[PDB]
Amino acid sequence: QRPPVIWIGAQECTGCTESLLRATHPTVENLVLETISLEYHEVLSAAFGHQVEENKHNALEKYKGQYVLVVDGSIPLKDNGIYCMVAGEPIVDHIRKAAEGAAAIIAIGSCSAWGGVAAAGVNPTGAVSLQEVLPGKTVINIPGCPPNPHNFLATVAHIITYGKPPKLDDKNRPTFAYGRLIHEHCERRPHFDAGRFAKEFGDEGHREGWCLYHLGCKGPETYGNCSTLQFCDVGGVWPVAIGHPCYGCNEEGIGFHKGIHQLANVE
Amino acid sequence: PQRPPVIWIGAQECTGCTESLLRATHPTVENLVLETISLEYHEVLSAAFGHQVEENKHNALEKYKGQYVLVVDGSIPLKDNGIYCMVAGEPIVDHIRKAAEGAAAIIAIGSCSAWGGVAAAGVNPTGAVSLQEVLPGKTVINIPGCPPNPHNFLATVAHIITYGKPPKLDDKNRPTFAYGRLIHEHCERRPHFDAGRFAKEFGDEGHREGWCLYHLGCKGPETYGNCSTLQFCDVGGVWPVAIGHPCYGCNEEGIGFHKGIHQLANVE
Amino acid sequence: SQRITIDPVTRIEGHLRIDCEIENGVVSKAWASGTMWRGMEEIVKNRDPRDAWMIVQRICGVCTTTHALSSVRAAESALNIDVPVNAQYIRNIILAAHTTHDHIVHFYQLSALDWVDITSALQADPTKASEMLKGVSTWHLNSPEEFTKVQNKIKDLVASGQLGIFANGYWGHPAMKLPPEVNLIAVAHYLQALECQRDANRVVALLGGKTPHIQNLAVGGVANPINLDGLGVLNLERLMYIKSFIDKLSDFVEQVYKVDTAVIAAFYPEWLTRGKGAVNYLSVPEFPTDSKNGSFLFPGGYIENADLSSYRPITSHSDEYLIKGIQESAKHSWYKDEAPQAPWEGTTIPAYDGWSDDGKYSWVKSPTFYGKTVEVGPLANMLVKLAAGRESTQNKLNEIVAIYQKLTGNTLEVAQLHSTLGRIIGRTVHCCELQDILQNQYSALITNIGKGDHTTFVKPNIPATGEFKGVGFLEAPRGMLSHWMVIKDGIISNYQAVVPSTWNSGPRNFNDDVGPYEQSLVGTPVADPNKPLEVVRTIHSFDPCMACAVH
Amino acid sequence: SQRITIDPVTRIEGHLRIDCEIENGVVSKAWASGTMWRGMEEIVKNRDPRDAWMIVQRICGVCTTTHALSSVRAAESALNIDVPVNAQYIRNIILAAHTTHDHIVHFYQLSALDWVDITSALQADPTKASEMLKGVSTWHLNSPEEFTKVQNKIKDLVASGQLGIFANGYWGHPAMKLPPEVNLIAVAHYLQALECQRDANRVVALLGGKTPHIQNLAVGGVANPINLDGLGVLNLERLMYIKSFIDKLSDFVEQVYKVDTAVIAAFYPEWLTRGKGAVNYLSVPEFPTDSKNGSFLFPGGYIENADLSSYRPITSHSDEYLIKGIQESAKHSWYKDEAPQAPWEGTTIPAYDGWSDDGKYSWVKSPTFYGKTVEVGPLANMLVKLAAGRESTQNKLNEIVAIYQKLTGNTLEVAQLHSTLGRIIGRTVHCCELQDILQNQYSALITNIGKGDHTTFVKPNIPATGEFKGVGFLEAPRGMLSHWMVIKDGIISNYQAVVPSTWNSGPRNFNDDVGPYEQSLVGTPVADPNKPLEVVRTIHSFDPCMACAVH
């Protein structure tokens, strides 16, 4: 028997699910066949409509107290929740019901972790975070837009393998992935230190792999593991390594708030 | 289509430089030998042995005169008239000088052929020297490391094939794309260095938080290479420092195999 | 007769509700409803034009890359910027590799379980299954041994009593027509597909900096620093790595996906006679290869009343005929302003009043082209290519038809492509032709770098006064995408996205005309109204993306 | 008689010359010669004991990891350090995964072209080839389609006129006995092998920091920082990654390598009756799992005169019987001191005087165990395991024999393992059992970390005066390895490596007794003395590593 997981998408772009299709340890096929039982996920479920609704209810009863609940996307509270309606009911209600019986609750992605892009600017739909919708519950936050999928998978594995969540910071983010500023573990720090800065994409310094601070890099104010774990498990692939500043997508008040080329505050 | 010919001669080699190729992914060793090049001589993989493989060498040197890339791993021992490495009854230095005569390009892969390496270290029992030292009239492209990331070699070969000339080289004839910068001038633990956050012993708290390894003897400050960026094995996040061990300076003459693991580097 | 609701529709991107009236076992009328809105157009407003792409990329994570690219193209359109050719090659490789991933995942992970019964696969003889593909495919992973491994995984899943994503599927449904052996073949291919799509996205990641959500674009070109001799930048070693993944895509695409497309058609030939959504089709040209945002590798055009012979070519993203035709209405949508709006003058003012069959029933707007309803996406794209006389497209379609003929003894005519299966076929053809796009553009990049051109970025200037309008067109996996940006006093004063799934999924329009999803369902036989598999088959053929449709 | 020289012997590590006297087409006498020396023992002298491992690892890059591990074990022996159990788990995973790579490459890339004729493979019927393996293997990549792809690669290579590594091979030689179909099977497996060995080394890299030449050891334990909650260190994500590669090895090992071993034996049964190198065998126990450098997963022992029933178990790396038995002579080697030397008292003084049949003819020394010649390596290691009654080893051999029986109708007895093919079989059995070592030690590590033990390193103290001595044993891919370190006034005053290929390849000893390579060749039929394939077949079975043998 494999540990049950219930995944509900709110105001999601599906990028957080799509992260799983890049994963290698486990791959998505090994995740769903070997590591977990994915009891509800609308992107992959064979069942639709009334049949998939049955699966949800069956799973909530059968696995009460045992399942991991995962939510991607923000939860819109404006106008009584009507900005995201599934089977005729506000998504906030589906989420609160599923949270009642959850052994652990995970907000995957910046949207569910802190509102993200969906809650930015004038916030048209009154989008909020999963934690805000579940004030009485401990929500594990795995931010990023989307996070490296292993930030999520290794959190789930810790719960399964050792019976408890990984250590968390004071935003309930796992320390193994979010315990340090990108700029406090970035391979271009020597260039920063020496005043060796890209000024425009395609200039000489940029073409020598210099620091991207003056292009608006938000590494100095963003917690994450983008410089170390990086992305896609091919080696050497993260925004800065490719030539673009960090935008702060992990970090509330940075990504989707500050302009790309706006300079970060350095501690 | 015809593939560009390569002749590979091992001198005082441990075979790690060849073995690097079996970790490569772009190209994989099977695609290297079937699609990218024609590997006309390599003793580790050649079906032919003895007199037959000797014929292959001679035939290749004649047929591809002026066209082939010559590659050497290992140091070349000059002490006692070359007898510390004898193949088919002749000193390896002679085989190498002969093959160099017709080479379009000449590559020392690994620290041993690049600058003598471990084999030439300390008392240097066999009077081991670098490829460049045995070929004073030739431009030798040096691809150091013990062994280098195989793509440091493969991308150099690809540049020669694709664009008809070597990649840009530094004043040690090392390709700049791989050896153009100190490891410490592109190391992700520089912030920790800068803050005085240092591992003091393996297994201590700082070490277990991924702090800088300077005080464990990291030679990143005096070693040129791409270990922090390209890293190794194409899995992501794998190089000595990332795994928890200081750079030993294996790329760099006078560092690797000279300084102790725990001896401190000079910082510029 | 009766009224059914399918909510949620699964195995799509996003939140979709489908309602159907059924009369005498056949759908008589349908409603498509996007049930989630974010207001991404409003979120991006009032910002610097350069910042838009990183925000609006988050319209969708399935069709990641596409909104980013459309956004920078829109800004470049407004500002009159000619993108460096290297930046085009890189943009093109990303889009082509992304779309490869996208299409493979759609056919297998999203669509196959409409046509494939995993339970029936347990009864298959693996050897017979393998034998069925002799002379049909040269794929190296169709052995009885492969099929046995796959069958045992299904066996173990079922035995565990934890079906998960497979629970309560349509196993045994009368519309399921594959023999056990072909069901097993499909499940094996479903699992193999996951490796191929992973390789496609490794291409994307090495140029984009990650995927989902690339981070290498700019208004003015790309952030990739081309330097063959540079450490830490886009050098020959990194390019070789990209190439190694490009080369891993073709075999699966050609020997599995393409073949399975013909196989499904062969067993479900009635599905070539239903699921027609429109008589008009639009696509834009794609993959520009010159220094002036043109010279596209793929052609675009407009087909009216299904007449390929008199289609109108579109060879430029500045084509005023295309630009001037496009409007959107919110008469039957949950927005305030209902009259058709050109997107430069568009508004997006929420006005939710609940569901009404005759009133507002969707967050999706209703696009028209010169007042007509239009289908976009792979069917449109293939038909336009056939109308253009594109030999590569006719040849690739012919290969699929040749397999179908081998299996059935029948041929396919163009008339039969205006269907659920025709739509699926168009997508497959696209995936196949994209492999040549990748080879072509990788080669172009290597060659251009060799001539000494390492330019990737032209820094924009943005006047602090004046009003400038720009449109960025892109032929996305699900069809023609357009981002419409108005700049006034240096900032975005209006932003409107008109997205392919908006065209196809949009509700009844200003004249109460029916959009493609709604039209395609009329006449769908439904054996069991409680389990309307037949409806979902047709809807899935459009590859719905509702985060896209609504934004 | 006729005199032949094979120089260089290819498809080994390092520089080897083999000479043979042939009488009426049978080898009557042989000489093995290591023709390259570096003096690695002298290079490492007069250094801090902690520095040795990074230097002496470079004895060999084929058996990378092994000299590094033996060196730290030797220093730990001298200093009386008990290695933390987590350090043992990590060392064990590296060694097991390394050896997996090593053995796979030996069977395919180094050995197969002695037995396999690529020209003949061009004549194969791929379907017949696939059919031959029904009920012999469940491997998923034995389809006719796979075999056809492989056959076409060979065809294209031959047609190119550039055979490269395949040029002037022993195609059509009378000793080549495989039918076209089995030749094609082997070439397919040769190419597939390269992916499996790559996955094995991904395991090694993630713990070692790279491979070749790991960089995670220390005198005192390992440099890996265990912290499940740490960024940039060995956390659960990294461990999961390691596990993903561990899991990818088994199927190829079990369904291809193991099966091919039986297939080669089935077609070459005469090779079970020649190539006996010795009557005595040694192996050391390996993979310690306690906190005191003991509790090995694999047993060791000494077999005398081929009598398993009376073998002597070795269960400790501190075994005085083992330690005191080992000596080396340079009577027929190019060193000055000729009398047998215990390695703590060893010298390595070069004294090259050219080749002489009756004098000195090798850079390899001549090891003895209590004055006897001994074979080390996988044959020794298997025989010792069988003598120990290790069920896992008997079961794994029985599986190989069952396949052989299916193909030939015959069984194999232990007497037939004292042979070229027995030696190959021992290596295969080792590779198979190592997969269980990997699973076992990964689980042990995860469990131990879960109990709160994150310790990895015990810092040594090294007295600045006094003279003291240590020995590090390791069961390497090619057999028992020992590093012998004497420390005086805090630095290395003597360093002697006695390496498995030293045992096997060593020349005639102090009493002119013949070592395993030289003995194994007596009786070898040679059809064509110009092309002595038969000789190379037997020599290759020992997996020669001459950088190892000589150092």
Ligand code: SF4
């Ligand atoms: S966090 Fe980013 S990727 Fe995930 S749902 Fe939100 S917008 Fe999409």
Ligand code: SF4
């Ligand atoms: S500003 Fe950005 S690129 Fe520069 S060192 Fe900091 S995180 Fe790295």
Ligand code: SF4
């Ligand atoms: S450079 Fe290192 S890996 Fe290469 S031959 Fe020398 S010792 Fe071996």
Ligand code: SF4
């Ligand atoms: S001393 Fe070593 S670990 Fe520290 S910043 Fe420099 S190269 Fe990195």
Ligand code: FCO
């Ligand atoms: N493809 C795609 Fe997404 C949709 N519809 C966009 O654009």
Ligand code: FCO
């Ligand atoms: N295996 C190995 Fe190398 C040899 N002989 C060592 O030790």
Ligand code: F3S
């Ligand atoms: S934009 Fe996001 S993905 Fe990492 S590099 Fe910055 S936190």
Ligand code: F3S
């Ligand atoms: S020891 Fe060598 S492999 Fe790189 S990290 Fe230092 S140069």
Ligand SMILES: [Mg+2]
């Ligand atoms: Mg500029």
Ligand SMILES: [Mg+2]
């Ligand atoms: Mg819109």
Ligand SMILES: [Mg+2]
């Ligand atoms: Mg020795």
Ligand code: NI
């Ligand atoms: Ni989309």
Ligand code: NI
């Ligand atoms: Ni070796």
